[PDB]
Design a protein around this nucleic acid. Structure first.
Ligand SMILES: Nc1nc2c(ncn2[C@@H]2O[C@H](COP(=O)(O)OP(=O)(O)NP(=O)(O)O)[C@@H](O)[C@H]2O)c(=O)[nH]1
Lengths: 44, 246, 267, 214
RNA sequence: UAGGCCCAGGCGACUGUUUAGCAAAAACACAGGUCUCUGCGAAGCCGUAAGGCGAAGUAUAGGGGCUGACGCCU
RNA sequence: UCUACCCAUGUCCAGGGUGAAGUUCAGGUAACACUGAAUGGAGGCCCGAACCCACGCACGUUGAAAAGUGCGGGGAUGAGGU
C-alpha cells in the first residue's frame, strides 16, 4: 500500500522553502519565531 | 436528416444521430482560429460555483462575425462547416475585396450565393440591414440590441423572430419566446431563419455521449441528507409591450 | 401422498383466533374450478357466528355454465356467493354494497346508539395460490402486497387501510393437517396451492389425462399437433423430441395451468 | 336576540406583536382584550383575504386554543382578491397546511363590505355552542378505547384500564394506567383523533388527563 | 494451461459508482419524460467590494425540482 | 507528497471471436423494402494475458505485514489505467 510520504525535492522547496515563507506575512512571523527560539535550521 | 442506428447492442437502442448533409469541408481555416481551454465551473478564486460541468473533448474557437459592417464589397459563400462551440453551422465568405470571414448560416444557403450587407441591400436570405429598411412581415435573426455590438438575440439553431410595427425611433419585434418588445431602429439584423432546424430531435442514447459533450452526473436533492425572479424595478421595463406569459 | 403443512400454517390459525374480535366481515376465497374441494373445513370450524360471502376467483379460466350453476347451489344453500376476476376487475364493484347490506343491522344499531359510522373491517381467508393478495392490490389500486406465481409467498398477516372505508386483513393460505380423500388432493395439486416438490407429478399427469379423456375428448383430440386417443400415456408424451422418458409429465402439467387448452372445470 | 335566542358580542380592538408594542401605555388596552376571552366561550378569529397568512395570526390563535374555548376561523374582505373556482381551495388548503394545531375549527368566508354570506356566520356559532358543552356515555366511551389500542398494540408495555369523562366544557377525559410516564405525546395525540372520529366533536378543543394505577 | 449444464419465480431495463480498513446490493448514477425561472450587465451562484463562473453561449440555449429504457393502461 | 474533484501536457492495453451502416451483382419489379452472393469493419459487443479491482473459502491475529498470503472471481477500446 502507498504510504503517505512520497518524497520529492521540488515540491518541498516550493511549499516549505525559504522564499515561499518570505513571500507572505505569516511566513515572516514563522521565521521570526524560529529565530527567537534559536533553532539551527529554519525554513527548509 | 436523422439517422437511426440498428439495435446491435444494449447501448445503441434508440440512439439517433444527425446526417451532416450540409457540410462541404472537413478542415477549418488557420487564420480564423484561437485557443480555448476548458473550465470546470470554477472561477478566479478556484472555488466551484456552477455544478454539473467539466470534462469533454478538446475544442478550438472559431471567430464568428456578429457585427457585419462590411458595406458594399459583395461576398460569395465558399463553404459551410460544422462548429463544435454552438448549435448551428457556420459559413465562410470570400469577400471580393479579399478578406475572408465567418458568419452564421441561415437555412437555405447554397454554395456560390452572393450576399451583401448595408442600407441598400435587398431582402433575401443572408443579407444584413438596419431595422428601419426591412418591411413588415419578414422573418429575421441575429437581432442587435444597441448599435455597434454584435447579434445578441435569436442566433441558436432553428430560431426566428418577426417584425410587427414601425413606431417612430423604434421597431416592434416579436422574439422566439413569444416576447414582444421595441428595439432601437438604428440596430442591424440578418434576414432568414437559422438552419439545422432538426437539431432538437436528436436522441443522445447513451450515458457516455453526454460525458463526451461535457456534462457531469446530477444527484437528486432528496438523497442529499413559481416565484418570478426578474427584478421589480428593472430598467427596460418600459420597452416590454407584451409579457412572456405564454 | 400429500402432507405439506409447515409451521407458519399452524401459527396462522392461532393468530386468526387471537384477532377474531376485531373482525366485522369475512371473505372466504374459493377457486371456481373446484368449488367444493377448495373449501377448508378446518378453518371453517374456527369461523362461526360471523357473516361471510363466498368468492370465486380466477373465474376466467373456468367454464361459465358450471360456475353459474355452483353459484346457484351456494345461493340456495343459504350463503351468498359471487364470481370475480381478480386480474381485471369484473365483479369487484359489487362487493362493498353487499358488505354494507350485510352489516347494516349493526351499523344502524350503532348509529342509533349515538356514534358516527366507521370503516368496515374485513378479513380475507382461503387456501394458498388463490388471489387473496391480487384482489387486495386491485381493491386498493396501490400494489402494496407481494404476489408470485407459486404458493407460499406471504408469511405474516397484515393490515391494509383502504381509504376511510375499509380495513382489510390478509393471511397466508392454510391447509388441513391431513388429507382424507385422495381425489381432492389430486385436484388441489393440479390447480397448484402445493409446493409441487413434495408430491408425485406422474400421478397428477395420469389423473389429468384420464379426466381429459373422460370429459373433453375433443380437446384431447386437438391437443398440440397430434390426434390420437390410445390406452397408455407414452403415445402423446413422445410427440416432439436419449429423450426424456417421463419428464414430459411436467410439460403435460406445464401448459394446462396456463390454459393452453380451452376453459374447463373439474367441479 | 337571534332566532328566538339571545347573544352577546364583544370586540377587542385587534392585537399586534408583543415585541413591537412598546407604546406609551396605550397597549394597556390589550389586557382588556385578553380579559374578554376568559369571559367568552366562543372565539372568532378574523383574517384578511387580500393579504396572505401572517405569522402573527398563528400566535393570536394560540391564546384561544390554550384557553380551552371553541374556535371558528373566519376570513373577511373577499371583495379585494379574485372570486373564482379553485380560488376557494387555494386559501382553504393553505390554512390547513399552516394552522395544523387547530383542525376542528370550521372555515367560513364572508366579506363585510359587500355583505356576502354574512348571515351564515351564526349557523356556525350555534353548532359550535353545543360541542363545547357535551358529554358522552361512560359505557360507549370505554367500548371505543380498546378497539383503538387493539389495532395499534404499541403502547414495560403501557396498560389501559379505564376511561371516563370529568368536565362538560371542554370535555376532559382521564385514563387509568399502570404509569403515566410511559405515555408518549405521539400516543396521547393518537387517542384524541380516535375520539374525535368516533363522534363529531367538531369546532372545540379536547384535553386528556392521565392518572396512575392508584 | 483452456466453459459444468438445464428449469421456475421476485428485483433492477442495460454498461458503470459507492461505506480506504465489516455492509457491492434491490442502494447512487444513467439514456428518455415532465414542471418551473430567465430577453442578455440574463436568471442563478463565489466574494464586504473590486473581480469572476454561467459564456464569449442567447429560449432547438442556460439554472433549479420530480421521476427514471420501450411496448400496452394513467 | 495520502485520498475527493478539476486544469495543461505525455504515455499503456499479448492473442482469438461475432459481423452494423455503406458499396457491388442481382430472384422481385416497371425499380423497390425485401433473397441470396461478394466487399466492408461499427460496438460504453464476447472469450481471455499485462494492468486495475476486491465477490467466496482457508490461514495469519504478542502476524512476513498497524489490511497480507494461497486457490477460485469481475473489467479488460472505454462513463478506461497511469
Ligand atoms: N388468471 C388469473 N390469475 C389470478 C387471479 N387471481 C390471482 N391470480 C394469479 O395468482 C398469482 C398471485 O396469487 P396470490 O394472490 O399471491 O396467492 P396467495 O394466496 O396470496 N399466496 P400467499 O398467501 O402464500 O401469498 C399470480 O400469478 C396471479 O396472476 C385471477 O383471478 N385470474
Amino acid at each position: 500500500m502507498k504510504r503517505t510520504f512520497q518524497p520529492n525535492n521540488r515540491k518541498r522547496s516550493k511549499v516549505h522553502g525559504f522564499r515561499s515563507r518570505m513571500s507572505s506575512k505569516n511566513g515572516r512571523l514563522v521565521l521570526a519565531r524560529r529565530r527567537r527560539k534559536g533553532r539551527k535550521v529554519l525554513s527548509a | 436528416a436523422i439517422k437511426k442506428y440498428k439495435p446491435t447492442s444494449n447501448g445503441r437502442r434508440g440512439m439517433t444521430t444527425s446526417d451532416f448533409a450540409e457540410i462541404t469541408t472537413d478542415k477549418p481555416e488557420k487564420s480564423l482560429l484561437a485557443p480555448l481551454h476548458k473550465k470546470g465551473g470554477r472561477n478566479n478564486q478556484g472555488k466551484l460555483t456552477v455544478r454539473h460541468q467539466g470534462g469533454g473533448h478538446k475544442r478550438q474557437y472559431r471567430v464568428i462575425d456578429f457585427k457585419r459592417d462590411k458595406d458594399g464589397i459583395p461576398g460569395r459563400v465558399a463553404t459551410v462547416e460544422y462548429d463544435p462551440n454552438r448549435s448551428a453551422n457556420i459559413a465562410l465568405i470570400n469577400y471580393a475585396d479579399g478578406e475572408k470571414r465567418y458568419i452564421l448560416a441561415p437555412k437555405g444557403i447554397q454554395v456560390g450565393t452572393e450576399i451583401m450587407s448595408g442600407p441598400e441591400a435587398d431582402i433575401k436570405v443572408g443579407n444584413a440591414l438596419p431595422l428601419i429598411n426591412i418591411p413588415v412581415g419578414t422573418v429575421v435573426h441575429n437581432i442587435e440590441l444597441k448599435p455597434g455590438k454584435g447579434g445578441q438575440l435569436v442566433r441558436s439553431a432553428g430560431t426566428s423572430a418577426q417584425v410587427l410595427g414601425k413606431e417612430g425611433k423604434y421597431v416592434l419585434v416579436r422574439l422566439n419566446s413569444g416576447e414582444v418588445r421595441m428595439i432601437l431602429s438604428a440596430c442591424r439584423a440578418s434576414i432568414g431563419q437559422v438552419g439545422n432546424e432538426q437539431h432538437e430531435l436528436i436522441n443522445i442514447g447513451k450515458a457516455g455521449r453526454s460525458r463526451w459533450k461535457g456534462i457531469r452526473p446530477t444527484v437528486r436533492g432528496s438523497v442529499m441528507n413559481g416565484f418570478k425572479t426578474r427584478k421589480k424595478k428593472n430598467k427596460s421595463d418600459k420597452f416590454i409591450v407584451r409579457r412572456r406569459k405564454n | 401422498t400429500i402432507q405439506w403443512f409447515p409451521g407458519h400454517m399452524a401459527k396462522a390459525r392461532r393468530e386468526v383466533t387471537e384477532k377474531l374480535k376485531l373482525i366485522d366481515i369475512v371473505y372466504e376465497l374459493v377457486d371456481a374450478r373446484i368449488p367444493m374441494s377448495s373449501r377448508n373445513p378446518m378453518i371453517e370450524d374456527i369461523l362461526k357466528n360471523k357473516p361471510r360471502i363466498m368468492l370465486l376467483n380466477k373465474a376466467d379460466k373456468a367454464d361459465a355454465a358450471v360456475t353459474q350453476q355452483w353459484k346457484e347451489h351456494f345461493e340456495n344453500q343459504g350463503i351468498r356467493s359471487l364470481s370475480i376476476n381478480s386480474v381485471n376487475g369484473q365483479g369487484l364493484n359489487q362487493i362493498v354494497p353487499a358488505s354494507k347490506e350485510i352489516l347494516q343491522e349493526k351499523f344502524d344499531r350503532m348509529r342509533a346508539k349515538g356514534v358516527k359510522p366507521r370503516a368496515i373491517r374485513a378479513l380475507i381467508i382461503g387456501i394458498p395460490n388463490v388471489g387473496k393478495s391480487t384482489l387486495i392490490n386491485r381493491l386498493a389500486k396501490k400494489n402494496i402486497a407481494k404476489t408470485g406465481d407459486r404458493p407460499g409467498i406471504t408469511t405474516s398477516q397484515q393490515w391494509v387501510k383502504v381509504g376511510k372505508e375499509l380495513e382489510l386483513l390478509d393471511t397466508p393460505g392454510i391447509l388441513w393437517p391431513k388429507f382424507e380423500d385422495e381425489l381432492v388432493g389430486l385436484r388441489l395439486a393440479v390447480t397448484g396451492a402445493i409446493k409441487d416438490s413434495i408430491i408425485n407429478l406422474q400421478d397428477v399427469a395420469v389423473f389429468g389425462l384420464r379426466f381429459l379423456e373422460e370429459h373433453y375428448p375433443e380437446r384431447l383430440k386437438e391437443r398440440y399437433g397430434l390426434d390420437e386417443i390410445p390406452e397408455d400415456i407414452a403415445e402423446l408424451f413422445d410427440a416432439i423430441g436419449l429423450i426424456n422418458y417421463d419428464k414430459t409429465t411436467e410439460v403435460i402439467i406445464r401448459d394446462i395451468r396456463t390454459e393452453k387448452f380451452g376453459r374447463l372445470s373439474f367441479e | 336576540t337571534y332566532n328566538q335566542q339571545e347573544f352577546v358580542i364583544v370586540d377587542t380592538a385587534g392585537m399586534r406583536k408583543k415585541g413591537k408594542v412598546y407604546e406609551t401605555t396605550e397597549k394597556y388596552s390589550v389586557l382588556r382584550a385578553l380579559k374578554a376571552i376568559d369571559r367568552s366561550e366562543v372565539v372568532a378569529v378574523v383574517l384578511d383575504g387580500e393579504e396572505g397568512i401572517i405569522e402573527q395570526d398563528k400566535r393570536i390563535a394560540g391564546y384561544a386554543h390554550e384557553a380551552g374555548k371553541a374556535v371558528v376561523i373566519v376570513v373577511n374582505k373577499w371583495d379585494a382578491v379574485d372570486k373564482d373556482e379553485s380560488t376557494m381551495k387555494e386559501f382553504e388548503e393553505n390554512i390547513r397546511d399552516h394552522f395544523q394545531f387547530l383542525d376542528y375549527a370550521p372555515i367560513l368566508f364572508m366579506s363585510a363590505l359587500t355583505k356576502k354570506r354574512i348571515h351564515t356566520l351564526m349557523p356556525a356559532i350555534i353548532k359550535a355552542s353545543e360541542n363545547h358543552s357535551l358529554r358522552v356515555q361512560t359505557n360507549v366511551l370505554n367500548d371505543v378505547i380498546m378497539d383503538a389500542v387493539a389495532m395499534n398494540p404499541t403502547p414495560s408495555r403501557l396498560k389501559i384500564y379505564y376511561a371516563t369523562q370529568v368536565s362538560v366544557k371542554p370535555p376532559s377525559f382521564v385514563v387509568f394506567v399502570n404509569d403515566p410516564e410511559l405515555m408518549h405525546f405521539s400516543y396521547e395525540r393518537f387517542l384524541e383523533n380516535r375520539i374525535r372520529d368516533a363522534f363529531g366533536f367538531e369546532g372545540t378543543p379536547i384535553k386528556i388527563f392521565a392518572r396512575a394505577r392508584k
